[PDB]
Amino acid sequence: PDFLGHAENPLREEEWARLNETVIQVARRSLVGRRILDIYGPLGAGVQTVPYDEFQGVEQETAMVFTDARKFKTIPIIYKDFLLHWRDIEAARTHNMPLDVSAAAGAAALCAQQEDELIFYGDARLGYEGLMTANGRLTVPLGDWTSPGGGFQAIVEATRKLNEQGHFGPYAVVLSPRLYSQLHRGGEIETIRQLASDGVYQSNRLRGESGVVVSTGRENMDLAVSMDMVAAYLGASRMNHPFRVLEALLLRIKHPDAICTL
Amino acid sequence: PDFLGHAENPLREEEWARLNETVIQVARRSLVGRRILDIYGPLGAGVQTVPYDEFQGVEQETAMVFTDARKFKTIPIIYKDFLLHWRDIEAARTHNMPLDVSAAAGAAALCAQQEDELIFYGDARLGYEGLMTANGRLTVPLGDWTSPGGGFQAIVEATRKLNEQGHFGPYAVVLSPRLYSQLHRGGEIETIRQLASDGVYQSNRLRGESGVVVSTGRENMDLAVSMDMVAAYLGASRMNHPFRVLEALLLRIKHPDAICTL
Amino acid sequence: PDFLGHAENPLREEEWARLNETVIQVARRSLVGRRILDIYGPLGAGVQTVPYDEFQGVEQETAMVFTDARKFKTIPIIYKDFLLHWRDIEAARTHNMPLDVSAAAGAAALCAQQEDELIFYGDARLGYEGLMTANGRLTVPLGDWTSPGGGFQAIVEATRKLNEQGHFGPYAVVLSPRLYSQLHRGGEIETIRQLASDGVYQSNRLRGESGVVVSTGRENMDLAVSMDMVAAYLGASRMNHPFRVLEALLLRIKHPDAICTL
Amino acid sequence: PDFLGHAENPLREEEWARLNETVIQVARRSLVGRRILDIYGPLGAGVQTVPYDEFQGVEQETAMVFTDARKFKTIPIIYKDFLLHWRDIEAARTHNMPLDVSAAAGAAALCAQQEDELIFYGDARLGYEGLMTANGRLTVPLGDWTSPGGGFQAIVEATRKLNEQGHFGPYAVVLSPRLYSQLHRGGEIETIRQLASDGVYQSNRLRGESGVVVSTGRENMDLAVSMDMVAAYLGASRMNHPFRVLEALLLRIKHPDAICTL
């Protein structure tokens, strides 16, 4: 039975691994920032604060007191809860029928949307900054995208001004849906991907007529992931089984002038 | 100790088996419908819906689409909660003294009363029907039971009219307490048990001056039991241990004209 | 799978044995003639004709030709068909859930009703006789059963006249429902069971205000059962599985004056 | 010989596996909904009903009765019959020559056409809904597709309105042949595949000047496949061998506002 008491493990090893791979594949399919940002590895669930800066480095009958000049920030956690019926779990095992993980997929999609929202825009009340709200970014006037080549000229101007401060490298462009739906002239996206070697992507979190061009590289910006998106058991409730899809991560912008918004 | 942390199993194997047999014996002692109904086996906790009908059975350059004409209904669950103190459980094991299962017995009795109520009368809002509320039943005018033989004549009339549609077989009679308390003439119940071979029983769920005669048989009516009455651990609360006596079952009336109410 | 082709055995050994025991128990619960008749054993499915009489027993330059004076009669077969869905059988095995045998139970009940009808009344067009239609039976005028002891006096008269031809022995009485529903005076059935040692039974096949008293014994009447009631597979149809509950048996009345109808 | 009697298996293992792979490849080549829908696994032939909703989740001297609020629907079966001559099967084995499976291929193609018809349009008499007939779908006025970019603008409007309710994600567009034959301006399909990441497909079941855009994901819509398309033996007829290509599946639309028809 295994349903007549509180359980350490309500699902079998294969059921947990089908819940985890579904969560991971939904996250990979719905996340856009992981394709333009470098990951500072999976640090571990025990890591709570990370340095937001780079380490620079620095007696007469008195000892010296050395304190790190680097600033530290705590890693936020984004989570979403869902529930599984116990009779459905009993049906998976005794009938030998697959388990439905639609609730887990929906929770993972919502958590991945929240992650991209946090990456592109910060919070302004917990101290977190985003790519579109960082201080020091380079901002270029927008141009008429309806004309053939207006978006190309805007990207050229953005690239040139981002170059003028010593940031070149492969470039990555992320555009709002309202800008992305104006590239209908033909293969006009392919003549912007030749200036953006890392890629041109569409982000639904971007609001209004806005886009961003970033000079990629670990020296400019990282995504410190304390723990990757995963599903965890919150303990049985009233015979039913609640689970939580959670991920802990932070965005570190070390060179705020490597970002150029439109 | 085993009380200093959350537990998979707060009771020992013998304690669980003394809780389960007490629940089963209370259910058997307090249930009347299991003596007049045939059980469609213990289907399992994974079974959630069952067919309410019997399977009857049923190209030109086009494939055919076959859908079952049988109707399906979901199996209801009846449950009752009780609580066990942790110090009392510690006293069972360390003092080697029996455990008190009075709360479990009371919960089982309440759940068995609810089961009989659901069997005899449906719900009318969740779609469930009962023996006294089914459409198509055969209803006979009642007679004066105070006179000697009035109940016998009522049962004879009920039997004859139930016969007139091809339903004979061993007959089972279930009477309300107010009808059962009117058989004081002597061994008058024993001259009705000779017409009802399956038995004459008393049911406290029956309301008013009412009774029922059923032509027993799997072809006429079944009691699909997804899972038998059992006690399950709902997880530790604040050091204390809540348990739930639960049973999942449904009543299937396939020949509604095999039932005759008084 | 085992459902992707025509099958020798659609059910497992345990499924066949649960179909067979259900058929047998329904037959035993619904048959009344097997309690008053002696069985001439299970002869076998290969037996088609049986002698209807008892063997009594019976040269000048010419051989003699001996032909048995016993008459022979062919054993009738009573059958009823039902159907099982293939998806339900697949659900029994893969889900490990019990199989529903309600159709088999209904077919067995109908076949058992037909058997009792054939036993009590013959056919008159295939040559078969019954207990209530045999030539030579002893018939006694009926009496008013409403009066206290009228049925007892009728049975006494029947017993005395059945005695007057050398037939005593344990007596067996079978009454119609309309006669059986007139024994409400009290334990009046128990004062007739003291004259009928084999038993007083109720038969729904008997029509009108009629009953029968038989002097039991193999020398007077037998029930030759070529094959007992059993379920057989008629071969797959269109993915679905038809089965047949069948029984082959005949009633042999060797002393027609050992039967007394009311 | 093996043709002189009824057979469990008229074909050899390799012949069955060449009949099954041909059926599967025809289904894969002729099915379009399996490329835009997520499959709720092969549940098994024993599964007959599935929940059409998502599980949400929910004493005083009285037990509580809990009934699932989820609605259940039965899984339809689509089948097509074909026939194989016995002399042709004998020729496959004794001559060691390949077997012709053209009839199986045709039956699989017809069954796959019926599956797509059922997916896109329901039945309206058995309770099944489709992508083009669901209640709650988002419907956008159509535009002149002859003009260069009219289809692109229609898809942009559909995407924006489907976005306005919280459904973004990879988008999948399915168009009727009469709409698909109007993309002759050049690589205009490739500038709509940049807004539909899951793909733009053509469906012959769509009628008139109609198309659909769906926000893919298990949380929005699934295709519960009880059993995949397979060929089964219906039993020998008159020396000849009939087979049936059958598939049991249902479409589950849990978020009807994730669908936008043109």
Short mmCIF file of C-alpha atoms in Angstrom, two decimals, chain A residues 3-9 85-88 90-91 94-95 236-239, chain B residues 6-8 16 45-48 75 77 227 230-235 244 246:
data_model
loop_
_atom_site.label_atom_id
_atom_site.label_comp_id
_atom_site.label_asym_id
_atom_site.label_seq_id
_atom_site.Cartn_x
_atom_site.Cartn_y
_atom_site.Cartn_z
CA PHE A 3 -0.44 5.12 1.37
CA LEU A 4 -1.61 4.13 4.88
CA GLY A 5 1.04 6.29 6.55
CA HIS A 6 3.26 9.33 6.15
CA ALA A 7 6.02 8.61 3.64
CA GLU A 8 9.63 9.54 3.04
CA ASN A 9 9.24 8.79 -0.67
CA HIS A 85 -3.65 13.10 -5.43
CA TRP A 86 -2.77 9.91 -3.57
CA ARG A 87 -5.20 7.75 -5.55
CA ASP A 88 -3.51 8.87 -8.77
CA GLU A 90 -1.58 4.49 -6.30
CA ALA A 91 -2.94 4.13 -9.83
CA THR A 94 -0.54 -0.85 -9.09
CA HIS A 95 -1.95 -0.36 -12.65
CA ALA A 236 1.92 14.82 3.08
CA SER A 237 -1.09 17.01 3.90
CA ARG A 238 -4.40 15.21 4.31
CA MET A 239 -3.47 12.02 2.45
CA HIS B 6 8.62 12.72 12.64
CA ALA B 7 7.93 9.03 12.03
CA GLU B 8 7.07 6.74 9.15
CA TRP B 16 -1.27 -1.50 13.41
CA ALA B 45 -7.08 2.24 -4.20
CA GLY B 46 -5.98 3.13 -7.74
CA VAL B 47 -9.46 2.51 -9.16
CA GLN B 48 -11.44 5.75 -9.30
CA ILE B 75 -16.33 5.85 -6.46
CA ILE B 77 -14.82 7.90 -0.26
CA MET B 227 -10.87 -0.34 -0.99
CA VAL B 230 -8.95 0.77 6.80
CA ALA B 231 -7.04 3.18 9.06
CA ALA B 232 -4.27 5.40 7.69
CA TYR B 233 -1.77 7.81 9.25
CA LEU B 234 -2.28 11.45 8.23
CA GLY B 235 1.20 12.53 9.46
CA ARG B 244 -8.24 8.42 9.40
CA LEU B 246 -11.57 5.53 5.25
#
